Design a binder for this molecule. Structure first.
Ligand SMILES: C[C@@H](CCO)[C@@H]1NC(=O)/C(=C/[C@@](C)(O)CO)NC1=O
Ligand SMILES: O=C(O)CCC(=O)C(=O)O
Ligand SMILES: [Cl-]
Ligand SMILES: [Cl-]
Ligand SMILES: [Fe+2]
Length: 280
């Protein structure tokens, strides 16, 4: 089974689906395809995902395997071997300019502003007053959220699922994938996400679900996984969360229609609990 996802594009007015019914389905499912801008170069990011795990013998990106949690004072960051086939390199935007290769930081900045534009179209369709967007999004309705540019490599030799079923933590994930393996559970059936290297996959995360859970049309965080890989696979994604710095956490809120925002938990708190459940 392959999912029939709606396709969108970023245009002069924001997210453009084929019509209003198509936007409504896409937002209800919590997953759709987004056309990649023709000027946007993804080849350095593609190369980074193929290389980051390989060590200093492999140029220019293999040396990032050596950067663990500890070099960043944030357990979330650096190279992480997961219990699934997946291994990752995760870096939050405050470190991009200093730590990533300059062309990788550039990529992360393009994706941040693209995701920013995507998120603002979603918030407008949710009927949340604009003056509440910054607090409801922990800064992602502007450019003051926390942003992780995360690179993924699936070790086909590991006898695990590729990546366990899960929801992402945040508001928006912009996923770059060029090979089969991603599956989504929109209703109660698992379905393959069709591969289209001209489109990103756009997902909503748990924060979008929490934020809109009391709205007239709640938006859901899509349950997704990566099936066991028999050959290697790589990908990367840009993740937007309520600002979750150590000691400067914007928090997670739900919107109560006609009332305002009610605090639910911390952003880092939600990330830690989610990561814990994904991998145990
Ligand atoms: C906030 C960071 C996660 C920090 O750990 C961000 N949000 C996610 O939900 C996530 C999911 C996984 C499955 O890739 C983690 O393995 N990736 C990310 O980059
Ligand atoms: O590699 C993929 O296609 C999905 C990765 C993912 O879902 C994640 O890291 O959150
Ligand atoms: Cl830090
Ligand atoms: Cl390894
Ligand atoms: Fe995910």
């Amino acid at each position: 089974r392959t999912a029939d996802l709606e396709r969108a594009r970023l245009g002069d007015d924001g997210l453009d689906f084929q019509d209003d019914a198509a936007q409504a389905r896409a937002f209800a499912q919590g997953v759709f395809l987004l056309e990649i801008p023709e000027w946007l170069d993804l080849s350095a990011g593609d190369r980074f995902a193929r290389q980051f795990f390989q060590g200093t013998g492999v140029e220019p990106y293999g040396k990032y395997r050596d950067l663990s949690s500890e070099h960043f004072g944030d357990e979330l960051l650096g190279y992480h071997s997961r219990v699934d086939q997946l291994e990752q390199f995760l870096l939050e935007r405050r470190f991009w300019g200093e730590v990533y290769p300059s062309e990788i930081a550039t990529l992360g900045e393009h994706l941040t502003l693209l995701s920013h534009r995507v998120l603002r179209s979603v918030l407008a369709s949710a009927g949340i007053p604009e003056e509440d967007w910054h607090r409801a999004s922990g800064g992602c309705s502007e450019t003051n959220g926390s942003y992780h540019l995360t690179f993924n490599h699936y070790r086909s030799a590991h006898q695990d699922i590729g990546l366990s079923s899960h929801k992402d933590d945040g508001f928006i994930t912009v996923l770059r994938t060029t090979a089969q393996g991603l599956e989504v559970n929109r209703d109660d059936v698992w379905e393959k996400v069709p591969v289209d290297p001209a489109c990103f996959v756009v997902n909503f995360g748990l924060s979008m679900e929490i934020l809109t859970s009391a709205c007239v049309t709640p938006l859901s965080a899509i349950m997704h996984r990566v099936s066991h890989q028999n050959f290697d696979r790589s990908s990367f994604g840009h993740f937007s969360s309520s600002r979750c710095l150590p000691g400067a956490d914007d928090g997670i809120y739900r919107y109560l229609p006609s009332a305002g925002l009610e605090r639910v938990c911390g952003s880092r708190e939600l990330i830690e609990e989610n990561d814990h459940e994904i991998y145990m």
